[PDB]
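Help wanted!
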Amino acid sequence: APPALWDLAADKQTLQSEQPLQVARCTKIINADSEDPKYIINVKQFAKFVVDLSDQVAPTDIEEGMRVGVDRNKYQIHIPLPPKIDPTVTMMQVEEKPDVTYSDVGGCKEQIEKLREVVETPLLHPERFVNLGIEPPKGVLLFGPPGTGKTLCARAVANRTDACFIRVIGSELVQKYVGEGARMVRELFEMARTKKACLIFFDEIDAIGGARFDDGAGGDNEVQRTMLELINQLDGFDPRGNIKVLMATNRPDTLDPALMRPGRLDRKIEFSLPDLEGRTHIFKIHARSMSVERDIRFELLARLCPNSTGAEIRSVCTEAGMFAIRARRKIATEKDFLEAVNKVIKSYAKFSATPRYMTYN
Amino acid sequence: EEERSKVDDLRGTPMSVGTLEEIIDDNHAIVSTSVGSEHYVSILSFVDKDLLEPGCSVLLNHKVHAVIGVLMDDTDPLVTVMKVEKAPQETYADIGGLDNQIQEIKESVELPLTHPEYYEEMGIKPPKGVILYGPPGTGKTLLAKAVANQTSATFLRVVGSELIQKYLGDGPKLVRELFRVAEEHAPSIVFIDEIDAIGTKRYDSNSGGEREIQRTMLELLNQLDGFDSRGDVKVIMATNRIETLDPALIRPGRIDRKIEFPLPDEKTKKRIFQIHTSRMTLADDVTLDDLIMAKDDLSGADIKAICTEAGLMALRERRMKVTNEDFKKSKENVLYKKQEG
Amino acid sequence: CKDVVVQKQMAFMLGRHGVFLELSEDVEEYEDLTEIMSNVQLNSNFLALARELDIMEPKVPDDIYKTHLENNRFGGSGSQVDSARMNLASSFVNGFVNAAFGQDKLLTDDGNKWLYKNKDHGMLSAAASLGMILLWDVDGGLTQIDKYLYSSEDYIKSGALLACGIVNSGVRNECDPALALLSDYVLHNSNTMRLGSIFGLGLAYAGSNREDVLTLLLPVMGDSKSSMEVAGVTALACGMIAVGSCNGDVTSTILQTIMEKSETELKDTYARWLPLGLGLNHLGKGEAIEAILAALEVVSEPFRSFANTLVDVCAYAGSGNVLKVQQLLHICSEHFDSKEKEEDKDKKEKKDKDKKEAPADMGAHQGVAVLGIALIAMGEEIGAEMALRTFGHLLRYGEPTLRRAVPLALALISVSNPRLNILDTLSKFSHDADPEVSYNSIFAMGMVGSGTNNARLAAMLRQLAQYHAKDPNNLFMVRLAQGLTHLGKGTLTLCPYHSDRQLMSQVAVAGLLTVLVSFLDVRNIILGKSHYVLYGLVAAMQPRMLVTFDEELRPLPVSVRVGQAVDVV
Ligand SMILES: Nc1ncnc2c1ncn2[C@@H]1O[C@H](COP(=O)(O)OP(=O)(O)OP(=O)(O)O)[C@@H](O)[C@H]1O
Ligand SMILES: Nc1ncnc2c1ncn2[C@@H]1O[C@H](COP(=O)(O)OP(=O)(O)OP(=O)(O)O)[C@@H](O)[C@H]1O
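Answered by r_m:
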């Protein structure tokens, strides 16, 4: 109540400041310039007004398509407004705060390194690459088995140095009432250019990357608009775009995006996925949880589950203590859980072996 | 005191209810109200400006389009579908034969939240939910485990793919709001039963297509995977046929636990008849041995329906005790039902 | 039983601490430090349940630090709690002797540490102590030396003449070469820029021991001052660089050297900083430098005696005798100063600690109202805040412009959980156009808000620095808000220094000078590249930094050199 007391007691100065600028309605888009003093302007009220500007605003600062404030009485220009587009879809597109630091890697070395130098090093030491340039690459492509999809990006989140970057979900591009995706894909680009080097990442491009053509009926027409408008706006020359790129999906399909990327993109890497000697690394990260007996050998257990990525062995460490709670054991003995680990790999492979290799093959 | 008699003169008497479009660091907020109108509002009172965020409803005082107070009003279409409640009288103790099946899921749903002391000290944390299924048409018997869960915490049940694909989408966004609303009600349980998204044949009304259906399901996986949300909104999936769903769905969830529903044996069926006929009154000559011997591959609701039709037929004679001749003659009706076509 | 007759019920017979919580009746506890000696077995949980019984209470078993007391009992039992085992005694003993900056604990405890003979003094005197922990700090550091400081040496002298000296103070530590650059430069005498430089003079060698206190104070008399920025800087040096001296020469040397220069001091600019060379090291110190420094009070100026006599009279000792402030109130006031009396009851209310006497001392609540702000600030030291009711009641009930003073109480009570409440409240005070509550807000968070970092802080730093306002409050807001990201941590190991280089490099493109930008770029790296000390809090043992509250009280009306006096830090 005290904060609301002082909060409501500022209305006496607020009402004195309420006289000016409260007639600033509304926001209006300009059209053309006939001369220096006089400009034609349109407003959402549907009435297009040709009017002059206030003497407190330099006329050279107003460019075609700039929204400005208006004093409805005189209709003259009051103050320009930088923000224009878009409603809540943008704020949903924005993400903030870090998580999943680099210590969460599962042993991948050359992978994580080669993708570190494409994104983090150019913005960490810009003068270095500009000096020795050449020129940094445009971006990368991620795909393959599920372990570990999409978490590698979380690494860039926690390793982001200063300015936060934006993540984007794929399926929201395609929408009912065709023609909404056109505005969608366009606006975020301008936003990014104002965002000075901020990163834009699309997940599951295979949803909007349906290629190419079928007999009838479309069908892919509303899809092809989304992807092709994407590539066309990606192939513009101004800047373009300094915001770099980041891409991830599941299967390498389809051919149209895959044939369009190597001109504009580079550095396609494939998982990898745990190597034999690398499988133990996931066990080293999960070893900090619960309590590891000094006699437990990770390398012995690791070979018994090939192609499990990190998820399944996470459930191995999980079912250890899970079945230990049911048996009241405080620590999980190596021989105790493995009897349930051969069962937890086989029983879940019985109905399905999870053949992601078959998904794209 | 005096502030209540002051600020009221500024907003009233008439005022409009608009929507927030975007906020400027100059404390001028751009509001949008019916129809297609904009403005600069700067007020230092009742805000709460940081918690508002664009895309929410704000008041408009006639002079001039000022926002005196914040309004969060629900209602809302989706918020209506989660409640209430049930808190059903049924319990997990009214079912039998799945003790070996139920032990792990009952543990898994009471693993977090209640009984946290052995969970939090062990540092396991498998909060991806559970996945259910079974034959031939069960999954409601697995729902008979959801009733016990409805007795604890918060519950929400969203079933059937018709709610997305009946019309054009906008795809998952209907599910995307279920995630966040369950986050505002966290902890809560979200149960999904019988997922036909890949098993459906004909879409409802006019919508397309088979592959767009898949893409809304895939975005459901990334929502569920997920990057990046730690909230629960515990999710449970269930269906009749797991073979239809793609293996692409299993790694994000449920990677730890999935259960299979076995067919009941003679001992189980005996238990089932016991539990249903507990409240019912039967004649002395009714025996539980011959009944389960004559039946082959029947679930709890089948032996339930035969008793319901036995009592319905006994209503024709207005008798509360069902005789064995009436019971067998009634049993022959559902027996002839499944055997007619 | 406790009403009239008998005494010593089953509570002494039975052994229940649950009823022992209820055994005691309301009485002064300063005497209750005593109990029946039981076996260390019953003494351990005895002391645990007694502790948790005593935390709410003003006095805690941690009293051995503050009190005073000072009798040999707490040193005897303090080295007897680890008696007699000298091996597993490694903790609470070695960490205690090497974690001690002052000489009193290792001194009384030195006479109370009977392990071996005469050679325990090797693990005492904080020579090998600060040496070992300083090389483990080099084990867990460290700060860049050649690149930043020499690339800055290409830039010759910055225009701030302000924050650049304390760099080489805390950084080096110990090396001589930059010490002769410090000195030989500050021989030019420019402003108070000599300050952090001569502070590195004795802080370098004194980083381990002893040190420099031979040539530390020579510039004092070497440089009539006629003010602090001239001969008072080095006069501050040996007093603050002391940190455990006494020893005992440095006491009588400081008292002597200040009794040399008196009318030129005079009562004002240096007398602010001198008691910090005494009261720090010893509270119950027999020497009274208050009287000899209080004979100079006659100048009658009400203004400079605010910030002068405030921590001038409060900084001599912690006392605890109830007599001292009565003395100095009568001989000082006489009468009264009509002004200082405020700060004098503030000094009383300072003397005792959290006795709960302060909530009874605020009933005055003058139109001056500074009684209530520091009275609630210091007046309650307790783990549970419990001060939200009154801390909010004084701002909601208080007269105008006192709410400017209000956030300053965020220093003490907030050591527990600042994250929730501080950026909450002060987040509303941050975008207020008032530079005073913006300044005292960003300080209100300040150091206690620098304990740990967050994404809200670094993300909030944006557009805090995009404001078009002039004046130092802008880059004190933003640039002080920079130092809250971490403290004495890095850079090698751990967080990269390139991002700070790019932030302070891009924000300095403005104005262009506006020399305050060349002041801010060093400002963040005071604490940023200082390192070599972990705090933590200061401190974990529940003492308090004396230079911080003192100095942060003056620039509240920040004007000219008070900010650099505070920039001693
Ligand atoms: N090699 C690994 N190292 C570290 N963590 C791993 C590894 N493999 C799997 N994981 C963990 O397993 C979890 C499950 O992976 P997830 O299901 O998110 O992949 P995905 O995003 O579904 O893949 P895709 O996007 O290709 O379908 C991830 O959070 C990840 O942290
Ligand atoms: N062992 C048991 N004890 C008690 N009741 C049982 C037992 N097994 C099954 N049941 C009951 O039998 C019912 C079986 O439901 P059934 O499978 O017929 O639903 P359904 O109509 O197939 O649902 P859906 O159409 O959504 O698949 C459950 O509601 C359950 O309560």
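OP: Thanks! One thing I noticed: Chain C touches chain B through three residues (CB under 8 Å).
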